[PDB]
């Protein structure tokens, strides 16, 4: 009951927090240059591709719960 | 038919303190009174709190 | 300069604040709520823009962050 109830509020935060992480990495923000091992912008969008497919993966946990 | 009457006294007993309080300003009021409830007609810190 | 701009934009509440208040029983609390929000929040901004005004230091930056924001700013 509560493990089904705690999962939706984590997923509702998991879709809000990780989408904005996707948009902040799409705009190639200057504060986030620690996570990068015109060419450097493509690495930034790659992390935004990474974030979004985990932001969408929390929607599946919402329907399962 | 006989009325109940209300007589005001003039004692020197210390009156209690009371605060007008909404549902909003109730939590800020009893977080001041948890330390010490104020004297009669003292400056209430709870609007500034 | 925002210092001559924000002195009246946080000065609207607290001077024109008690001028437009409804006549309900919460007048002595909402005016206290509006004035103290104008005093605390504006002075919090005031002691932060004065710390950077006339400074003494410079940002010690990492070596990858020497040439990076030349393309970004």
The reported resolution of this PDB entry, expressed in Å, is 3.6
Min Cα separation C41/chain B (Å)? 14
* Whole-Å CA distances, C70 to A29, A38, C73: 13, 13, 6
Q: Where are the domains of chain C?
A: 1-73
B16: exposed, middle or buried (Cβ count in 10 Å: 0-12, 13-18, 19+): exposed
Residue of chain C nearest B44, judged by CA positions: C29
Give the phi and the psi of residue A3 in degrees, each rounded to 5.
Answer: -70, -25
Alpha carbon distance C30, C68 (integer Å): 49
Name the method of structure determination. Answer: cryo-EM
B6's tokens: 């209300």
Mutate to test the interface with B, among C18, C24, C26, C30 (most CBs of B within 10 A): C26
Q: Which residue has the tokens 């409804």?
A: C22
Closest of C5, C4, C1, C6 to residue C44, by C-alpha: C6
């Amino acid at each position: 009951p509560k493990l089904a109830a705690c999962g939706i509020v984590l997923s509702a935060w998991g879709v809000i927090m990780l989408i904005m992480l996707g948009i902040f990495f799409n705009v190639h923000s200057a504060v986030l240059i620690e996570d990068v091992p015109q060419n450097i912008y493509n690495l930034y969008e790659q992390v935004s591709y990474n974030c979004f497919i985990a932001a969408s993966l929390y929607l599946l946990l919402g329907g399962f719960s | 038919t006989v009325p109940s009457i209300l007589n005001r006294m003039q004692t020197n007993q210390t009156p209690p303190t009371y605060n007008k309080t909404n549902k909003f300003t109730y939590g800020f009021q009893n977080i001041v009174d948890a330390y010490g409830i104020g004297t009669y007609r003292e400056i209430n810190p709870a609007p500034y709190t | 300069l925002p210092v001559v701009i924000f002195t009246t934009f946080w000065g609207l509440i607290g001077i024109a604040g008690p001028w437009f208040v409804p006549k309900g029983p919460n007048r002595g609390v909402i005016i206290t709520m509006l004035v103290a929000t104008a005093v605390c929040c504006y002075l919090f901004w005031l002691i932060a823009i004065l710390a950077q005004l006339n400074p003494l230091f410079g940002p010690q930056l990492k070596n990858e962050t020497i040439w990076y924001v030349r393309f970004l700013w």
